[model samples]
Target chain A: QNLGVKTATVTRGPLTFAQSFPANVSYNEYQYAIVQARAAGFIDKVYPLTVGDKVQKGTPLLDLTIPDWVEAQSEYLLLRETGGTATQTEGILERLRLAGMPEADIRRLIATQKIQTRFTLKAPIDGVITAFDLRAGMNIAKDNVVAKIQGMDPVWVTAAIPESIAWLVKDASQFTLTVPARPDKTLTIRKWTLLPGVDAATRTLQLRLEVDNADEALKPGMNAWLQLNTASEPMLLIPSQALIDTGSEQRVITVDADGRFVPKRVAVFQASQGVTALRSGLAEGEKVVSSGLFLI
Target chain B: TQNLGVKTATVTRGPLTFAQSFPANVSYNEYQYAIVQARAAGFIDKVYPLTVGDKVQKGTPLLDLTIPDWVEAQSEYLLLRETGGTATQTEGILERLRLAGMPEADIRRLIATQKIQTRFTLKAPIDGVITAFDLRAGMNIAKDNVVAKIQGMDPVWVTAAIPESIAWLVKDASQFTLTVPARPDKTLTIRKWTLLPGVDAATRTLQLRLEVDNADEALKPGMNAWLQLNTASEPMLLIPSQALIDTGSEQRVITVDADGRFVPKRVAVFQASQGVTALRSGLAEGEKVVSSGLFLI
Candidate 1:
């Protein structure tokens, strides 16, 4: 005796949207530093600095001798040597400060009653030198940028969120991102900012966040991949184990109201988890044999 | 065939998605190529020591040419600049240089530096690889002569021939997982795609093209790729692939009829995949097809 076959109902519901997209990485604006000269000067001696060299705060870059500054310091030193009061030297010190003299140079002049002719320019940030075009014995103008430092610890990650599912992006922390060539590394995000304007040509909203790049693995403008969940129209679902898919075609059998075993052709829309979404063939309430489907 | 062992299942409707893998081929996108050409009569006095396939960014000098017309052109332009000639008059000679294919950057540099030279350095027009560069250092080249061809590599086109059987599913497809054979660890994501219209009469397949990002330049053209295509979302009629009974000339199904009889009829196939077939016509939704024990019949 045989129990024949068991059947399952064709059901309709929403399909969870999951897909991947392209992302890009950029450097945050506040992360880089530009080193400029204080006054007109000629370089006397420079540290062995080159582009891409890492430097710490107060690291000496070069020694610049500005004649005008040295002469002013000499005049101030003479005034102090002649027993001038603090009020008498304060005006010269203030003028020197106003004339682009660095605070450290003023402190040195005040602390030491001697003409400090040379000023050793120091790096202002603890970062890698991204730009350096100066050398010893080169004359530089006032406010001329001789070196640039780019911080390596953090980078900005930006992505073009597609227009259709942009609204579904309600949370910044609930997404997955990976940089190419370093997929195994876990990236940390901070300071999430969604840009105000939606680009017309791309139809995408620009989403940005700061990602920790302590190892300097993520390069600027490097491509990153993003994953997110989306929403869509409902689809008809059936137990994935119920339908049969041979190399030739997709097929299912329907057990109608009278149990009149009838063969029906079907087209599949999609398959998620353990169920098959149907595109056409059977109504939602009709029963398709789930067990012993091959024998039906 | 006895009905004692017959079983049944109801057609259910809901959202579901399945991925099917399709083998693909990587190709250099043709539309993105930027060709370099000679814009003036010049002798290829000096060429860069570049080999075939060398990567060059836009504005990288490719070769130095000794153009006879350039000396006169620059000399006239500079005199016009210093002599305060009319804007209309100064425009004439510059226009000639442009007509001769000289880029604006060259004229601008000449203006900014106030330098004139007998040799003009030809530069790349775009960032790409040198696909073809056949000129020699001593060769004499004229205007409109082919120089070099550069191909962009930031993104490559991955194409697959979708069997006509499953071609109908292409329209509703949105998600795809592209696996590069060279790099097995990662699955490449797809952004834009093209479904070429018209079917191939010989292969009966539709061409599906995907744009794959290769900004890292890791993916080379002609690499093998596998793409898993997602099916449509509309609920459709599907039958177990085994339910199809094929005759040499036509395809059919065995519909169980009244009076213990079997009804065999022809059906049109919309497409076939997995273990199911989408029947285009000739079958009702409230029906069953004989799936097994056909040898006894």
Candidate 2:
């Protein structure tokens, strides 16, 4: 008898195919605010701030100077001082407001009897400046998005589940995430929207999740490994060590009653946790070489 | 030349759970909607007092159309059938009477009672709501005129728009919760969308039709539904948690070999506890790779 080999039996069991999906981190689309230029004017002076700088409401981001607003402001002052009718004073103020002059600026102009053309753009929300492309001394021709701010405490993590395992995510098991740089941050995820729709191009369905990034450990657009757990049906299984890949497919060596070494090509479904699930090629209770002289 | 340490795992059956949920819309069964028309020209001389949106069943008299041609032919058919004649002659008149747009019921009634009857009442073709009815008691109908449209009641089609995501998980005998928005207070009924073809390119949503009981006639077309789809049990996954999905890294390293003996001596570096991170995997499913020092070195 040959003492050069060890063996394991082919068996059948349940294996909820534990799976993993890639997740993309992003800012909550609904929770962000956009700041825009209301009137055409030159950006007089930009504040010394970076795109990712934290900002509070009323924080001055930049300054704008409009010559037209100065001319319009004086019209209201002169007409009012002349004891003009409501139409004359009110009509001129209408254009002034339409041209981006706020009512506060008009009130200050009327009280001081002076023209004011420069205005500062302030943050309207307490958030981080996620976008800002303006520079000093540039003409703002029309109302345009000047800066974009986004929330930080609660962030959105989107996963494009492959169609193959997307159903598993329908009643998806609890999942874990691996951050690329930051080593440790306990994230609390809040359930948000499911079935927002599907991404047709990649044939993947998108699932959005909210992660409480209170510590700010996770950043938008970070490549993260989305770990997920599900299960597979009872299948013919074996120790992964018993199977050998011959480039084309896989096979296992079996010893018959007379001790003859026979090779069999097997259809492998998957391997997890040190076990391989086979679709076909071997029966339960059959012996496959688990070690020694099997590779040949 | 031989060494032995035989260790084998028995091939046995095990358990797996695969659970999931999908959203389905309470949609109308298009096949159950139908239109009825008159075979010949006539005037609606009599009516049923039925209104549009009213429920009607098959064989229910919708209204009566006065066809003079049918009136004349039925009289001849009555006399010819009563006294009897050659088989072909009787058959010819009866066939001609049918061509005049006579109802089968009228003819059977005439034969059963030995009398002339025409101007039969047009009946409902199916059990449904009177969705389309254009004529009044005095309105004239042209030949082959569409009379009314009936949309069948009960047994509505519950369609699930399966996105390309999880479209593959579509299999039979799956369970889900379906409640129409208009009547979410009670159990309407229970219902595969698996037998299907074609996907909507714009939405990429493949539709699955589920036939559900609408005996109460509560659900209708163009109604939104609240759906809770539970993928079947056994080796399936339940939607996971946000604390973040933890990834379990594979446990493998430094598997030394026994010279040329193909013997594995499993060793360790420090067992990673899968920690608290999104899990990633390695190795081609069922691949068995050798190590540097020990596996049959």
Candidate 3:
């Protein structure tokens, strides 16, 4: 029964393995900006804005008039004329700060010593406007999110690494992202992080990569491919076909020194391209059944 | 933002490996059926007190037939003997009785009594159950007519199909635990006997055969069973499956770092069983992992 069986000697050597996974390109969440109404008011004027419009920090977004701000400012000026104490002046300034006024606007109010009713909201960061909910003649409440901004220079490339090759992604430091939209170009990424979570249905681990998208070509929802490079030190290697993948367990038949077939369970680091790297459960110089395994 | 009511657990070491289970079918190990036929043109005289499914021992009476041709041949043999026939002629008469399906005992009886008997009885060939037979009294039977069949039922076969990829595990397994669905509380241990070399092309599975003792006849053929085969064992780090967060593309666990802050760490894992998984790497012993309310940051 074992006449046609073939054997190979297990050898210790370096084995380099690489893997690729489907990925997606999107805006970096860390660079996202939520433009909200700092105080309740009626929108008096709104700038001509659309989704995907790039803007810089302090760019005027809209102007709204808050009736309560007029009363607060009137009291503050009254106190200043009546020789209010420094503590009183500081208390009113803190009140204005809590009203969602930016430091620049507060400073301007102090320098001009004027009562400002209609406040113009500006962009908080340099980014492309992704969404907006405010328009001229609309009433808004305090802290209402009115617009959304996201940076475009560095986009995030996300991919799900199946549990089988998840180890490779954990130790991988560099990767290249390719998009079908721009097949002629590739984006190299060096900074990445593994997000904490898994998909219940697919059983995959999420990985995030920061790739340069200065050309604004790789937008959110664009499909991409992630190529991960992984290398390891010298280890025991054998023909992958010699290993039996039982789904629940992994095993291999080895011919011992006495010419007896011995079934041994092995932990595999990588099983691909006709070669398998053993993590444990076997020693060097052992003969492994490489063919005619059915006989055993 | 609202605080998430969350729970956590610690990673621990245990024997986290498990084996696979497969559905099995029970059947007769090997059938020993006798195809009883008539020796000559005859009339069914009487049938033994037996029916399908009745147990029979070796040498038990099964049926009787009256063949007139055999009686005529015997009478001629007797007349020739009285007429002082040669030794060759007498031997020829004895050969005729042998060819007529008469048992040696019956032939000896005829030689000692110098009389002819027309009725002959057939006995069971082996100890078994009468599986099939159709014989009636006063009915005519010919050489091609089958009278009865008996099938042995001591050891029964339990067969199961195992995926071809994992068929190697059965090669070294000598014993397996079987549980019949009808009698869930009772488990029978069967010894491995053979593995069919043929593989099912559609399912990519190989058939495995095991022999089970059924001396008491408690197990019947065609019963459904669950076969459990234990494979290799190993110790590994196990954690609650719910603790791992899978975000479509990646799987990670929010581990409580040394500073007690929730930190997301990627880990390679293999499913162990219900609500549990074994970690291949990326985790250390005694580290805490979040188990509940993972959707909130």
Q: TM-score of every model?
A: 0.41, 0.41, 0.48
The regions of model 1 sitting more than 4 angstroms off are A1-13, A22-24, A56-58, A81-83, A157-161, A191-209, A221-223, A233-239, A242-296, B1-297
Per-residue lDDT over B1-297 for candidate 3, one digit per residue giving the tens place of the 0 to 100 score: 235577768899875323446788887755546656666677876776777778886668877777776777788888877898997998887887787677898888788876677577888887777877745678866776777777776667888886543443343544366778777655465544666534565554667777776665687778888887654324568788878767576777777875656767888764444457877677988888877754553
Q: Pick out the ten consecutive residues of candidate 1 chain A with the lowest summed lDDT.
A: A161-170
- In lDDT terms, which candidate is top? 3
TM-score of chain A of each: 0.71, 0.64, 0.67
- Shift in Å, residue A81, candidate 3: 4.9
| lDDT digits (tens) for residues B1-297 of candidate 2 | 343343321111221232334556666677788788888887876667787778786658877767777666567666665587667887787778677666676778877877566466767878988887746768866888788888886667777766433443444444556666688767766543342434555554556677777877777767777655533222211111121212343233322133533322222211011111111222122222331221142
Instruction: Give per-residue CA lDDT, model 1, range B1-297, as digits (tens).
Output: 555465443222322344457779998888678888776667877778787788886669888777776677678778987799998888888888787666687778777777775467778977888888856668867778788889887767888986544444455335677787798865565658776533555554667777877766788877788887775534446666577766564787767665656667777654444456556466777666666434455
Candidate 2 shows a clash count of 64
Rank the models by lDDT, top first.
3, 1, 2
iRMS per model in Å: 15.9, 13.4, 10.4
Using TM-score as the yardstick, the better of models 1 and 3 is 3
Best-fitting candidate, scored by DockQ: 3
Model 2 lDDT tens row, A1-296? 45677767888895544445687898887788888777777877787888888786668888778766676666667776689998888887887777667788778887776577577878878878877855768766668778888878788788776434543444423566666776674555667444423465553557778877877776788876677665555678888888888565678777676777677878765455567777678888777767665232
lDDT of 1 at A38: 74
